[PDB]
Amino acid sequence: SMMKWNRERRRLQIEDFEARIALMPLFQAEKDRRVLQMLRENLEEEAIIMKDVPDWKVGESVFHTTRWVTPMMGELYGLRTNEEILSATYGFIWYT
Amino acid sequence: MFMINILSLIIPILLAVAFLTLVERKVLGYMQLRKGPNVVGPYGLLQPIADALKLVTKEPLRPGTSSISMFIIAPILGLSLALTMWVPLPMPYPLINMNLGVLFMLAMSSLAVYSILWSGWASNSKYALIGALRAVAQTISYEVTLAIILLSVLLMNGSYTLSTLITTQEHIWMIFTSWPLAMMWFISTLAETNRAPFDLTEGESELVSGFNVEYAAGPFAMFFMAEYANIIMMNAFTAILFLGASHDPHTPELYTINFVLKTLALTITFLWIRASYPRFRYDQLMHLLWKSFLPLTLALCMWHISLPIMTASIPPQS
Amino acid sequence: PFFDVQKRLGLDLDRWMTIQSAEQPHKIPGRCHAFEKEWIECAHGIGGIRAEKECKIEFDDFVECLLRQKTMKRLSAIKRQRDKLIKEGKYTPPPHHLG
Amino acid sequence: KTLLHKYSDIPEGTECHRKAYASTSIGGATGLIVSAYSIALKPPASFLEGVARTGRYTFTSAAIGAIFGLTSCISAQVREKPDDPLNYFIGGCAGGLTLGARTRSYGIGAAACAYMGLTAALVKMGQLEGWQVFAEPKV
Amino acid sequence: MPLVYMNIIMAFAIALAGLLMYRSHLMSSLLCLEGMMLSLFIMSTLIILNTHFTLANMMPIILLVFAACEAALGLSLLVMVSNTYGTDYVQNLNLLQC
Amino acid sequence: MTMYIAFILSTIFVIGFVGFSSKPSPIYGGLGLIVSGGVGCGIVLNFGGSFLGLMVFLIYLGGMLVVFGYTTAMATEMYPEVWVSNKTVFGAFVSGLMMEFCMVYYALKEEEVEIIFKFNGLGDWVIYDTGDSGFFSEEAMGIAALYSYGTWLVIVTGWSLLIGVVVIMEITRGN
Amino acid sequence: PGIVELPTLEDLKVQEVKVSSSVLKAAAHHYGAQCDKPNKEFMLCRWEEKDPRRCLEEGKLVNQCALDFFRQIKRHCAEPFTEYWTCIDYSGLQLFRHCRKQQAKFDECVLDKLGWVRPDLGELSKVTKVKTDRPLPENPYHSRARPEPNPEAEGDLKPAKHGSRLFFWTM
Amino acid sequence: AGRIASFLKNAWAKEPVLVASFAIGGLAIILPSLSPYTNYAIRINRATPYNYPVPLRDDGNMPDVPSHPQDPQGPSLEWLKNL
Amino acid sequence: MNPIIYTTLIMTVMSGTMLVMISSHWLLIWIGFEMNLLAMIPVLMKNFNPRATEAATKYFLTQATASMMLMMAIIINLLYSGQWTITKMFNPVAMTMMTMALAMKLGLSPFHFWVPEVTQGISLQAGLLLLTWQKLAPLSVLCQISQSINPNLMLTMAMLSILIGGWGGLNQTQLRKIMAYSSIAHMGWMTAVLPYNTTMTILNLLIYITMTLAMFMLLIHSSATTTLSLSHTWNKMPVITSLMMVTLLSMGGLPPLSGFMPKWMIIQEMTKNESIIMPTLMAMTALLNLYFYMRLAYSSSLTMFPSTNNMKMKWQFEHTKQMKLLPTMIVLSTLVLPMTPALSSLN
Amino acid sequence: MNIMLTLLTNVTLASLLVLIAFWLPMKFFLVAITFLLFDLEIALLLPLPWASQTNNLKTMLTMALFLLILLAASLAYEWTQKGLEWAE
Ligand SMILES: CCCCCCCCCCCCCCCCCC(=O)OC[C@H](COP(=O)([O-])OCC[N+](C)(C)C)OC(=O)CCCCCCCCCCCCCCCCC
Ligand SMILES: CCCCCCCCCCCCCCCCCC(=O)OC[C@H](COP(=O)(O)OCCN)OC(=O)CCCCCCCCCCCCCCCCC
Ligand SMILES: CCCCCCCCCCCCCCCCCC(=O)OC[C@H](COP(=O)(O)OCCN)OC(=O)CCCCCCCCCCCCCCCCC
């Protein structure tokens, strides 16, 4: 009985996962715009705050390569408020 | 409203644990041709209140040769984990949905031996030192079989997510698949519970007091609740592991009714064994596991890992 | 190794784990897989002396990736200047920083 | 090697006060090292005895450096020759006399001048020609 | 290098200092020996968990399984010297003078 | 407050290390490390190491240290000590926390601590990385590779632990 | 080290889907099996280009194509769709095994009004030969030049001239 | 064989415990090889997808990979459906 | 110790050390070190005497922390580099941690303090394993990471090794103690050129192992542990004492004996690297090794110390041990100097 | 958030329950070491449930029994050579 039920549950998993794979293309685009909207906000603020600092040009690279790098969250969400920082870093780890 | 939910989980068990002393002595008496407490209130229903209002007014006497820091902390963490055990229990919807609840549950179960350790040491008595010595060693020695039994059991279930237990156990009880593990699991608790024949932790008639030591009044109270709330816990842990139930999403009431009855039945069986059987001996206490339980548990675990691959019945948990 | 028995026998003993750009369970990338690919591919068949000076740009970008250090210096001074410019009351944070 | 740079940076035959104070620091620094080891391998009595042992070891080492730096530098000024290896010998071994002074032994003081002066002369040769004791791996 | 990394290595450093600062009890040194492998475990885990070195999660457990194995022999070593000297005091652990 | 949970856990880790490494009575020294093991889990858990942190709670913290508490029972000094019993242990405890306290002060002011290594005193949350883990639980599937990718590590773990039992009973054999 | 030029805020205004998870996952398979054309090459862009910034043009199309699929249901059996996705959310796992009857109702409606068949098991999990117009990047990682390897050792071995040559040893 | 069968029954009399576990380990270690389903288990394990099946650029002459998820071309796990 | 268990336990040390030289992963290097440590403790406790327990306790307490310190620089190097491959260390303080950790597993610097007593406490055969087989595993790591070690730190620790090792041997009585101090002096000799050239470190290893293993486990044949006890052996087996002097003179390194093999080749390499004060002082303190080497030969064969009447009993009997591989081992440790070009083979 | 909050409130109630009731009124070592070794070996096969979902379970299969065999083997040695039988 357990063997038959377990095989049915495996078929349930691939049924559940198949939905996720169809869902992922929309989420990838949503996160892509969300993350790049925020970095656009980040250096947009950077121009206003940092102009008196003598050679702090806005949006200086840190990596010598010109290839895109997964942005560190410390600058994505970092300039934001304290609350959304807390709900993001230890958000999945803490939600229970 | 999280704080009320925690209180709604802490209040009932304390009210249960005090009120479980009533049925324990009374059910014991009824399998001893007695009536149990029945003169204080309707059918004795007030004794739980009496003892809960007596060990809290008895003056606690600290031992002369003792450090009161250990003499106080040892009772506290003896009970505090027993209430924390109920945090990840999947009563329809568990309070905390720890994806590794079972390991978390075993972690605090291992923390219980520490309350055995300093409590025996701090009192600094010949009974206290030896009483601790046998008690903690027995509990840790039977924890290794506890770890293996789960490893065999949830291997068919999936990961250690206690919420998944209802999903896998949905057509037959898991005991019907691993009943040799069931007796392995149920009896192995009887020592960690400090319950029946594995009673050498305290030794009623020959060691006066063991795990609890002489800790009286205050320290006694939550030491009494320490391995009393725990009894309701690993009664419930077995009642969710093997003797599962059904869970309708639109009616979680049925799951609770089935869960409480099976847990209550297991608690009565604990009391059933409490006085019916004689008491083991510590040499035999270790003889039983390391020479009979451990070799048999190892093979059964070996059977329970191969079997899902024998029939392609590996779980979809991940 | 002192006696590289792995190369002679051809059996993989610990090379699978040596770097995080090798095969990983279910193709999970390391946090710095991109830079590992660049540094490793830069420095192969070059030796342990030439590569440390020649393939330095790859290492510097990579050595920043693991423990991101220079970019917090970027972030720390962002926080310092922002705090100073709000303590005396000149720069007003936009509403998008809040709800 | 901040202390070593502190000494060697001062040109020979000038700024004798700085050279002496640098000499005391180097002599002082090695005083702590030997005394800390002595307290470790051999457990002293109560702390006042321990610092008494520490004070003696530091005092001699500082004193040996102090007089050596003074005489090694003024000799270049007085003799108007800083390059000569003898400019370190005449003070390098006087430290041995200082060691004999604090230990009260003519034999150990004289023998230390025989050895320390030679080594102090050798150090001057090391800086002159380009000798290296911990040479980097070249071949 | 963030602060959370610092507090662990510094805890290792103070653990290292106390290990080799034997007081008159071998058990305490064995306890202070216990510090680093936990500090090593913690320090290793933050590095590996942060950088998503999936296969490297091996080593934290691999660190613990054998670094506790000396403690298995060390405790028996401690009870061995306490079966002939009757004491874990380290001042009597100097019979090898000559 | 909540934003400093990894920082607050890390400093409790240090004070727990200072207390037990200062060598009080061994049974008390175990407690000083037990809480350090307790707060050590929070750092691992907060970083996604749910299994590894919880694993440390079962073994070691709830495991081997029980034997340490066991060992200090029969093989104990006749007068177990306390930080009040001796003066040096009291001084060591104060020195460790003062050194820690002077250090966090340096970290909070300029975040440019250079001692030994070059540290940054910014918030603990920055080092995290952004990105979904899909359905595989990264850590959970990392150590599950013990039997798919472990290979050599498996036999050496088995052998050494097996050799862990030939050594033990041999040395405590009583000639 | 240079400029981190990134797209302005102008192009980051797409008609974002305003639905929730349950309604997203209620359709899922039908949406995946009817809007694969903008999903595949956009995801292929995500992998080949290895940079979010270069796939903004395909990023908006997939969201836009979602709307055409979504409002197509509204002109059709959306009432059975509402009953479905309002029964999925009630389960905490968002699992289909407890909403089989509404699974049928959505399927039977969409079967004839539109014709979107139910994707069989494993059909979505399939590598596809998506047609694309963009050329593959010459170096997706923007890798720089490669150091020239040291010259290769060659030449037939010759006996060591005058033997060992170590001190006085000969032969 | 007579003494060996006697010894095995000799074991079962003075102890029933470790003989049972030795039997359990004995079977559990040997059936894995004598199995018509362990091949299915690895096939089932690999069948479940955790990552997106990254599409490949269509350069023509791709025989087996499909263009639509509902195209018949490609691997089918129908063997699991009746399983 | 049951011979089957004793054979297995030595095999684990055989396996543990072999694992280090065949591992390409930093963890696996630390992996075998812990197994090797885990297996020697019962071997040292062969007689279960209180002195043996003292030696085992000292060895464990000085080696377990070194393995713990070993792991410390591994993660720090991992922290700053992210690779576990056995290569150069890309962070300075890690390797500064590394060299001290590896050395104190061995003992050259003040770290060396455990070597004298631990050798004395354990049995003579047990002393052999600690002193002729435990010096390969740490040297295996140092050979692999020799590219970038700080020359200042390594040479200073090598200086202190030969200087402290030779100096303490002069005032030693128990032949086990002279063995430890002789080993400490020679370990600095072999590791001094380690930053410069690795081939002549392994040269010293094979050369030192052969003479040390031969003259240790020949001393087992004499069944003596003190200078007076070794002195008596001239009457019983004068050939043993005569062979004892040959390896003792080889031990010092007097040409044409093969014990001058390392000392010659080391001075050649350090001179090639313009380091010339370093060898001369290195050669000078080697005279200290010869002095107690010569003193032991004085009491062994070069003179005749008084014997005992009861020792006439031993003349009627004979040894039972088959001195496995002993006779050939003196030959290739005192006469192999003309085979000097064999250095290139080790490369 | 909820995890340590639950721990905090549980500690407060337990601590109060005593305060309201305080102010108002070789063999043993040998088995323990064997426990530590077996308990430590137990940590090896704990991640087994996730390990049963790999794509090469054959290598997972045989090596998992290898740990269990060695637990059986280590028990066997500690069994026969007196060992687990307690000293007298
Ligand atoms: C293909 C098939 C695969 C699986 C097949 C598995 C084998 C067949 C089934 C075998 C039996 C089941 C497993 C073994 C169980 C017994 C283990 C054992 O050691 O037994 C002998 C042991 C006694 O063994 P012993 O001590 O006489 O001999 C052992 C060997 N020597 C002597 C060397 C040590 O039985 C017990 O210990 C009895 C229990 C003692 C504790 C007191 C409480 C008992 C309460 C009983 C009533 C309640 C039961 C509740 C059950 C659970 C409910 C949820
Ligand atoms: C050009 C730059 C430098 C300029 C300044 C010159 C150099 C620094 C000053 C001189 C340093 C070397 C001379 C020795 C200094 C230490 C002397 C010392 O410690 O004396 C105390 C004591 C002697 O007496 P003791 O052996 O204890 O016996 C009697 C006990 N009641 O001895 C002891 O307690 C210790 C044991 C004896 C001495 C051991 C060796 C100590 C010196 C090591 C080398 C130092 C080299 C310094 C210079 C080069 C490096 C910078
Ligand atoms: C490089 C520098 C020098 C190095 C070597 C220095 C060696 C001596 C150094 C001084 C030693 C201490 C003082 C003397 C100690 C004497 C030790 C001893 O045991 O003496 C007594 C002993 C008695 O002799 P016995 O053992 O009975 O054996 C007799 C021969 N069968 O005597 C013996 O045991 C001695 C046995 C000698 C055996 C000689 C065998 C000769 C073989 C000749 C083969 C010829 C082949 C010719 C081939 C021709 C064609 C090519």
Automatic annotation (TrEMBL), chain B:
<feature type="transmembrane region" description="Helical">
    <location>
        <begin position="68"/>
        <end position="88"/>
    </location>
</feature>
<keyword id="KW-0830">Ubiquinone</keyword>
<dbReference type="GO" id="GO:0008137">
    <property type="term" value="F:NADH dehydrogenase (ubiquinone) activity"/>
</dbReference>
<feature type="transmembrane region" description="Helical">
    <location>
        <begin position="255"/>
        <end position="273"/>
    </location>
</feature>
<dbReference type="InterPro" id="IPR001694">
    <property type="entry name" value="NADH_UbQ_OxRdtase_su1/FPO"/>
</dbReference>
<keyword id="KW-0249">Electron transport</keyword>
<dbReference type="GO" id="GO:0009060">
    <property type="term" value="P:aerobic respiration"/>
</dbReference>
<keyword id="KW-0812">Transmembrane</keyword>
<dbReference type="GO" id="GO:0006120">
    <property type="term" value="P:mitochondrial electron transport, NADH to ubiquinone"/>
</dbReference>
<dbReference type="GO" id="GO:0032981">
    <property type="term" value="P:mitochondrial respiratory chain complex I assembly"/>
</dbReference>
<protein>
    <recommendedName>
        <fullName>NADH-ubiquinone oxidoreductase chain 1</fullName>
        <ecNumber>7.1.1.2</ecNumber>
    </recommendedName>
</protein>
<comment type="similarity">
    <text>Belongs to the complex I subunit 1 family.</text>
</comment>
TrEMBL record, chain C:
<dbReference type="GO" id="GO:0005743">
    <property type="term" value="C:mitochondrial inner membrane"/>
</dbReference>
<keyword id="KW-0472">Membrane</keyword>
<dbReference type="Pfam" id="PF10200">
    <property type="entry name" value="Ndufs5"/>
</dbReference>
<keyword id="KW-0249">Electron transport</keyword>
<feature type="region of interest" description="Disordered">
    <location>
        <begin position="84"/>
        <end position="99"/>
    </location>
</feature>
<protein>
    <recommendedName>
        <fullName>NADH dehydrogenase [ubiquinone] iron-sulfur protein 5</fullName>
    </recommendedName>
</protein>
<dbReference type="GO" id="GO:0032981">
    <property type="term" value="P:mitochondrial respiratory chain complex I assembly"/>
</dbReference>
<dbReference type="InterPro" id="IPR019342">
    <property type="entry name" value="NADH_UbQ_OxRdtase_FeS-su5"/>
</dbReference>
<comment type="subunit">
    <text>Mammalian complex I is composed of 45 different subunits. This is a component of the iron-sulfur (IP) fragment of the enzyme.</text>
</comment>
<feature type="disulfide bond">
    <location>
        <begin position="42"/>
        <end position="55"/>
    </location>
</feature>
<keyword id="KW-1015">Disulfide bond</keyword>
<keyword id="KW-0813">Transport</keyword>
From TrEMBL, chain D:
<keyword id="KW-0830">Ubiquinone</keyword>
<keyword id="KW-1133">Transmembrane helix</keyword>
<protein>
    <recommendedName>
        <fullName>NADH dehydrogenase [ubiquinone] 1 alpha subcomplex subunit 11</fullName>
    </recommendedName>
</protein>
<keyword id="KW-0472">Membrane</keyword>
<dbReference type="GO" id="GO:0006120">
    <property type="term" value="P:mitochondrial electron transport, NADH to ubiquinone"/>
</dbReference>
<dbReference type="InterPro" id="IPR039205">
    <property type="entry name" value="NDUFA11"/>
</dbReference>
<feature type="disulfide bond">
    <location>
        <begin position="93"/>
        <end position="113"/>
    </location>
</feature>
<keyword id="KW-0496">Mitochondrion</keyword>
<dbReference type="GO" id="GO:0005743">
    <property type="term" value="C:mitochondrial inner membrane"/>
</dbReference>
<keyword id="KW-0999">Mitochondrion inner membrane</keyword>
<feature type="disulfide bond">
    <location>
        <begin position="16"/>
        <end position="73"/>
    </location>
</feature>
<keyword id="KW-0812">Transmembrane</keyword>
UniProtKB/TrEMBL annotation, chain H:
<keyword id="KW-0813">Transport</keyword>
<dbReference type="InterPro" id="IPR026626">
    <property type="entry name" value="NDUFA3"/>
</dbReference>
<dbReference type="GO" id="GO:0005743">
    <property type="term" value="C:mitochondrial inner membrane"/>
</dbReference>
<keyword id="KW-0999">Mitochondrion inner membrane</keyword>
<dbReference type="GO" id="GO:0045271">
    <property type="term" value="C:respiratory chain complex I"/>
</dbReference>
<protein>
    <recommendedName>
        <fullName>NADH dehydrogenase [ubiquinone] 1 alpha subcomplex subunit 3</fullName>
    </recommendedName>
</protein>
<feature type="region of interest" description="Disordered">
    <location>
        <begin position="55"/>
        <end position="83"/>
    </location>
</feature>
<feature type="transmembrane region" description="Helical">
    <location>
        <begin position="17"/>
        <end position="37"/>
    </location>
</feature>
<comment type="similarity">
    <text>Belongs to the complex I NDUFA3 subunit family.</text>
</comment>
<keyword id="KW-0472">Membrane</keyword>
<dbReference type="Pfam" id="PF14987">
    <property type="entry name" value="NADHdh_A3"/>
</dbReference>
<comment type="subunit">
    <text>Complex I is composed of 45 different subunits.</text>
</comment>
